[PDB]
Design a protein around this ligand. Structure first.
Ligand SMILES: NC(=O)C1=CN([C@@H]2O[C@H](COP(=O)(O)OP(=O)(O)OC[C@H]3O[C@@H](n4cnc5c(N)ncnc54)[C@H](O)[C@@H]3O)[C@@H](O)[C@H]2O)C=CC1
Ligand SMILES: NC(=O)C1=CN([C@@H]2O[C@H](COP(=O)(O)OP(=O)(O)OC[C@H]3O[C@@H](n4cnc5c(N)ncnc54)[C@H](O)[C@@H]3O)[C@@H](O)[C@H]2O)C=CC1
Ligand SMILES: NC(=O)C1=CN([C@@H]2O[C@H](COP(=O)(O)OP(=O)(O)OC[C@H]3O[C@@H](n4cnc5c(N)ncnc54)[C@H](O)[C@@H]3O)[C@@H](O)[C@H]2O)C=CC1
Ligand SMILES: NC(=O)C1=CN([C@@H]2O[C@H](COP(=O)(O)OP(=O)(O)OC[C@H]3O[C@@H](n4cnc5c(N)ncnc54)[C@H](O)[C@@H]3O)[C@@H](O)[C@H]2O)C=CC1
Lengths: 261, 261, 263, 247
């Protein structure tokens, strides 16, 4: 297994894409630390699901908007499993609103979680990676980091900024065994997206989720199909593998053709 | 002249690129409101420089990191000159540091001024532009919004984010007479850049500003010459003119070839 | 009174109609002398010349097939003899052919590559030595949004326009320390006979021959502004790139597309 | 037992360098592979045996990718020997370094023909069967030079940019199917086409990693694009460049 022995931390990995990434990393042999904002009654089941692949799996609740809790997550991983070798910055939120009425607090929260938390986690993990001469920082961006979409100003700004950050980290580590790269998914059927589909279904299609899902998807995604959490996880495993030793500062876009048009 | 009668606000226009933009907009016929962080002894001389072109000029001190002062700047313009028709989001700061030691407060400040302030000013100006059926929002990004550079993680993240924000605003206004675009300068010999070059000269070139300047340009800018504040202003005039009525959500890169390679 | 491009000699390939004519008009309005060009001599040439010349500059016409390097050279030499050294070169002659990849005709693929990409290389190669000798030049390549993104059934055109943008970058880098710049303009949909024919095909296929609905559907698929870009706007972009404020704009794209590439 | 087991791959221009590395990695992942070069050569048995060390079916076919009839012959040979072409890797590419002013016209034409138009012909010939079978991979070997420019490489940058544009269109025209089309963009790789202090000098200007990309890494990117996890990777670039395009 290509990642056997490596210690990975996936932020926001209690559901959706984050859980899919953690699952795929474990299948590839990595020990994994799962993380959610607050402790959930589903945490034990999630940890056992990931542990089914025979690696060491832990859970640590931490609000990634709080730098002290980011540090606590890293220290917990170092105590339980060892030095963080793979860092996946995934935790992120969405808020759909036109620019004129976009709430200031929601803008600030999206910037804080989708961009600044990745900076804090990366800052905390890089010293050990440099000392060991190996590391992977994998930032879960979006197609919205490469193009714009209406009513997603804060999210598009934060994801564009996360891609910029990725480039700089990669350039500062380019002569080391540390790489930094971003994965840019298109639409994946998570709760983050199911809520948006609900909103459009109520507003436009009489609550019909089949019709609304197709209209939502086909607006943006030429494949007329969702990307899966399994595919995003496969991209993360690829970036963490030796074949990606010279992939630095780039985007792996998994989007059904969204950015190609 | 092409912008005769239009009222423009340029944030951070007491120095460098912002002042060059204000001067080129005034040369093109616009009335202009200047802005700096705080009142300075040189303010009246800067007003005189911009007023040399025969238009109406005002000055308002306001900290763009404070949303209430942004609002005060807009209301001042409305009282003195009229509705804000051209908004140039320019005020910006830089801090050079590797990611591992990048100070948290400096990261936050760069995000706040170079990205979030533009969101606040745009939000405050859009309703009047929509009511009147015309507007220009011109965001001063950077080459660092399109590619990364070592030791500039916060600034690259902020400038990338500002370009993403530009796309979204443009898309939300695409069917109106309002456009939103970004200008992406390469190196311009302003105090923001002079300070970086002086730091490099003292740290690595024995105080030789000629050698430090050569090395600074040669690293990144194929033209081996600076872009000028007048050229950035000329790009702003172009975006504000009628020939740009259908230029929306794009970047005008004025960089001596930086991004082409 | 003198104008911003007064004294400069421009050549615009494929400038007897549409975008090329709009560019020629705007350059002449900005004070440039202009050589117009079409594939072959036509009865309309005189009227087009006089229309451009109404702005008080020197205007000429030369018929040349831009697929034939000998005729490209003849166009440049004609300009040198009639008006003087070519200082602004606008590579605009291009063609379109809509087809799925599986059935795309080989000859049409070759023709689109030849006109939309290789002709610009030939003209640029022929004009650069004089520009370098004089220390000043503008090469302005008329690309497309299709040089930055793909669209279905336009494989050859998207390939050629992407290639033209790559070529633009290299020319700009090889001239970056000189007074010569090279850049590309990337229009979205402009109401020209090329787009008109595409819309006619769409109308006869999907909307039963309704031109209003066909036009609206054609625009809204790709162009968020739900309005066409105009030939005048493309010309304004060319004038901007040719002007002194663009002395340090090198190897880049000016995208005039109603938001097409922003989403 | 392997992710590409049973898949039939054709790699154009695969007798050495990057193309051979791709063939080796595809076979390592279980693919049957047809190798290709311009002319029949000694060492062709050697390269076939090298790739066949991975335990799959390996063939060789000589064909000049500038000749549409020979491209068709390559595809038909593959269909006869192994079955339908399922993975097509377009890697017939050549280079010529020259300033624009003196760039030979025939060299410009040849670079466009091999680096761009040959990929169109091969893709056109392979797509109908892929559509019928419900699955395909078209993997175009582009370059960093398809995303940025470099001095003295006008024809190559134009052709590689064009190949990326072509990739987007093919992907969009197949987006609702089991066929994907994508491009791999390598930075400097230590091949004859490219080639201690001299090495660092050549790498320093463009490649921040100050090290070469390997042929095995380019092959690993092709295996990734051919795998099920890439079913919804469409019309994009996988850039393997040591940071070149990030700055
Ligand atoms: N779903 C999609 O279509 C796409 C999503 N993405 C990104 O993928 C990442 C995962 O999103 P999804 O799985 O769709 O959403 P989700 O709602 O299914 O998952 C959110 C996860 O983040 C955790 N989380 C939220 N706020 C947190 C905080 N402050 N601290 C710690 N953990 C926190 C939640 O507990 C949950 O584990 C997000 O960054 C999203 O922006 C990117 C592109 C496409
Ligand atoms: N100089 C360069 O090479 C490049 C600069 N830029 C951008 O151009 C913009 C202008 O920068 P420069 O002219 O080079 O710098 P500068 O230091 O000469 O000018 C900065 C202006 O911003 C004002 N400012 C700073 N903080 C402020 C605050 N909190 N509130 C209000 N005003 C404030 C300063 O008073 C000054 O007027 C910045 O956004 C910079 O990112 C972009 C690319 C290249
Ligand atoms: N019309 C549009 O929506 C867009 C067009 N463009 C590009 O703008 C340029 C002009 O296109 P349009 O004005 O729209 O089309 P058009 O058909 O109106 O213009 C074609 C012009 O090129 C000339 N021409 C054609 N083949 C020639 C040849 N072999 N030798 C010499 N001259 C030749 C024709 O005489 C005519 O003057 C083309 O490069 C097109 O690719 C770019 C983006 C959008
Ligand atoms: N070498 C590098 O640094 C980079 C190379 N590439 C691309 O990778 C591809 C392979 O290049 P390299 O391995 O570096 O070069 P190479 O010279 O080692 O490989 C050339 C291969 O193509 C074959 N070939 C050449 N012309 C042919 C034709 N007309 N028909 C059939 N086969 C033909 C040759 O027999 C040889 O097998 C080329 O497209 C190159 O542009 C991409 C980016 C970086």
């Amino acid at each position: 297994r290509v990642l056997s022995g490596r210690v990975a931390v996936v932020t926001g990995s209690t559901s959706g894409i984050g859980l899919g990434i953690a699952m795929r990393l474990a299948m590839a042999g990595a020990d994994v630390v799962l993380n959610g904002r607050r402790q959930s009654p589903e945490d034990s089941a999630i940890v056992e699901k990931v542990a089914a692949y025979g690696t060491r799996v832990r859970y640590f609740a931490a609000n990634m908007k709080d730098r002290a809790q980011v540090e606590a997550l890293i220290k917990f991983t170092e105590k339980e499993l060892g030095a963080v070798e793979i860092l996946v910055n995934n935790a992120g939120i969405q808020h759909v609103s036109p620019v004129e009425t976009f709430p200031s607090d929601k803008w600030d929260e999206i910037i804080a979680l989708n961009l600044t938390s990745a900076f804090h986690a990366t800052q905390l993990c890089l010293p050990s990676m440099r000392q060991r001469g190996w590391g992977r920082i994998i930032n879960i961006a979006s197609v919205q980091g490469l193009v714009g979409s209406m009513n997603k100003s804060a999210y598009c700004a934060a994801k564009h900024g996360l891609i910029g950050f990725t480039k700089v980290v990669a350039l500062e580590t380019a002569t080391t065994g540390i790489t930094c790269n971003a994965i840019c998914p298109g639409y994946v059927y998570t709760p983050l997206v199911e809520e948006q589909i609900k909103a459009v279904a109520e507003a436009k299609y009489g609550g019909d989720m089949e019709a609304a899902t197709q209209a939502f998807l086909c607006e943006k995604q030429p494949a007329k199909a969702f990307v899966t959490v399994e595919q995003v996880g496969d991209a993360a495993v690829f970036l963490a593998s030796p074949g990606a030793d010279m992939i630095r500062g780039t985007t792996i876009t998994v989007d059904g053709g969204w950015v190609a048009q």
